[PDB]
Amino acid sequence: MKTWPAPTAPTPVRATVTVPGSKSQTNRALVLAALAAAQGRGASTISGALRSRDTELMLDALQTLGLRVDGVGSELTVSGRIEPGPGARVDCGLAGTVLRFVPPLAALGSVPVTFDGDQQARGRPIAPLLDALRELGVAVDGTGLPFRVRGNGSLAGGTVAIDASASSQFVSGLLLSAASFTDGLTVQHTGSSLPSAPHIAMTAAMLRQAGVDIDDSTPNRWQVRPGPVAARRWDIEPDLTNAVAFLSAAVVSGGTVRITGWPRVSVQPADHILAILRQLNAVVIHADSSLEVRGPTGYDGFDVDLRAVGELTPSVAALAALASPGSVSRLSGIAHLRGHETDRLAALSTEINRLGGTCRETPDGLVITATPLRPGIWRAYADHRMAMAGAIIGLRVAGVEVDDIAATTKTLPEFPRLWAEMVG
Numbered sequence: 001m002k003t004w005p006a007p008t009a010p011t012p013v014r015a016t017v018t019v020p021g022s023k024s025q026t027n028r029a030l031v032l033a034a035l036a037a038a039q040g041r042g043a044s045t046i047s048g049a050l051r052s053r054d055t056e057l058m059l060d061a062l063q064t065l066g067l068r069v070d071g072v073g074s075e076l077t078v079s080g081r082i083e084p085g086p087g088a089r090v091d092c093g094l095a096g097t098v099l100r101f102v103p104p105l106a107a108l109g110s111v112p113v114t115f116d117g118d119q120q121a122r123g124r125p126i127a128p129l130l131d132a133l134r135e136l137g138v139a140v141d142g143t144g145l146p147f148r149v150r151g152n153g154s155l156a157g158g159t160v161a162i163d164a165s166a167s168s169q170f171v172s173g174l175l176l177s178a179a180s181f182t183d184g185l186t187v188q189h190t191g192s193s194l195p196s197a198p199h200i201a202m203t204a205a206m207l208r209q210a211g212v213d214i215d216d217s218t219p220n221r222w223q224v225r226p227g228p229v230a231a232r233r234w235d236i237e238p239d240l241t242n243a244v245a246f247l248s249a250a251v252v253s254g255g256t257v258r259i260t261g262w263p264r265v266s267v268q269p270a271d272h273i274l275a276i277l278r279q280l281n282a283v284v285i286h287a288d289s290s291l292e293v294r295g296p297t298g299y300d301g302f303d304v305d306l307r308a309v310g311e312l313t314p315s316v317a318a319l320a321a322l323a324s325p326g327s328v329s330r331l332s333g334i335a336h337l338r339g340h341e342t343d344r345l346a347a348l349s350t351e352i353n354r355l356g357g358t359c360r361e362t363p364d365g366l367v368i369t370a371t372p373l374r375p376g377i378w379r380a381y382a383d384h385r386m387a388m389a390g391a392i393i394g395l396r397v398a399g400v401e402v403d404d405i406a407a408t409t410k411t412l413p414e415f416p417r418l419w420a421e422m423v424g
């Protein structure tokens with residue numbers, strides 16, 4: 001595979017960028033649309049849907065269970081029922097949302113369904129949620145990929161305790177299907193350190209938009225009542241995590257970058273995102289339904305807690321590496337990143353140090369000292385965000401090439417084109 005040269009920016013970047021739909025919201029809409037259909041309420045449409053490897057693994061996942069998902073561009077329609085055929089086998093790829101959101105759904109079928117995924121996916125947390133499904137009535141063969149959900153046409157539900165410190169999607173995947181369990185579901189997260197609060201909140205907000213009743217008034221506890229899932233039309237927002245990679249270009253170059261269609265009120269963590277950018281003295285303005293960020297002429301080291309927004313770590317580490325010479329930056333709250341797509345703290349540390357930088361893994365994060373970097377080969381580890389972080393570095397360091405820019409297809413197949421167009 002040839003490498004991808006990251007274009008430099010010897011002058012301030014100036015651009016207007018459109019990023020496609022949110023991955024998290026798209027895959028939640030598809031699951032909720034499948035439950036509505038399976039319950040007999042009809043077809044649903046998702047407008048502004050992201051088309052990417054992660055959402056294609058989700059819809060093929062639904063098609064393996066018996067549903068029908070149509071559409072050619074960003075408009076997808078879900079219909080049919082759950083009714084897996086003999087030998088049914090879901091390919092999870094490296095998509096955590098499929099690995100975590102679809103086995104509960106599968107418990108509604110009365111046929112066996114295998115789950116499998118990439119070799120790299122078998123190293124990601126899954127056992128605690130499989131135990132929970134067992135405690136709820138479901139026969140499950142195996143405690144990791146590949147495993148089998150031998151459903152019985154329905155699922156009693158009830159109450160269940162789970163340690164979700166490793167991934168918030170253990171809660172989301174349980175909450176998304178709870179409305180079709182006989183008794184509904186009460187879920188209790190045991191212990192502490194529950195990462196990615198905004199994504200559990202995303203699930204709760206979208207469940208309510210589908211008319212489901214969920215009680216989240218007590219931290220670490222969720223109660224969902226059994227009831228209908230509504231057939232409705234979903235409108236998908238731009239992906240704000242991917243927008244941060246383009247915004248990062250304004251920040252490091254002293255430039256200006258605008259994002260079209262930025263939601264004024266979102267189901268995503270927009271508030272956390274804009275604060276972080278302003279921590280570095282970027283000027284952030286809302287204008288034209290677009291968000292404009294103006295980078296500072298320079299910035300120093302920063303301390304930032306990423307517990308609620310861990311998927312920002314690859315782009316924010318790159319920003320930290322490009323701060324003024326000798327700046328020290330500390331990224332915290334992200335031990336669970338040791339189990340993402342790749343172990344993101346080990347990988348970021350390796351690739352920054354390869355470029356002559358200074359990044360040290362900590363028990364919950366990274367400490368990074370800005371130092372002159374040199375050319376090299378930035379490795380992606382099959383991870384869309386490692387790849388974009390390589391692109392951010394390259395804006396300010398000649399000679400950087402990402403080995404596998406096609407890794408970006410997980411959530412942004414058109415990144416190379418969009419990125420060229422911005423820097424141009």
Ligand SMILES: C[C@](O[C@@H]1CC(C(=O)O)=C[C@@H](OP(=O)(O)O)[C@H]1O)(OP(=O)(O)O)C(=O)O
Nearest residue numbers: 024094095096097167168169195196199311
């Ligand atoms: C990691 C990633 O994104 C995640 C998306 C997700 C969700 O429910 O939609 C919740 C979080 O997971 P966790 O609590 O396990 O950190 C996010 O970090 O992708 P993934 O769906 O393959 O796990 C990503 O975009 O980087």
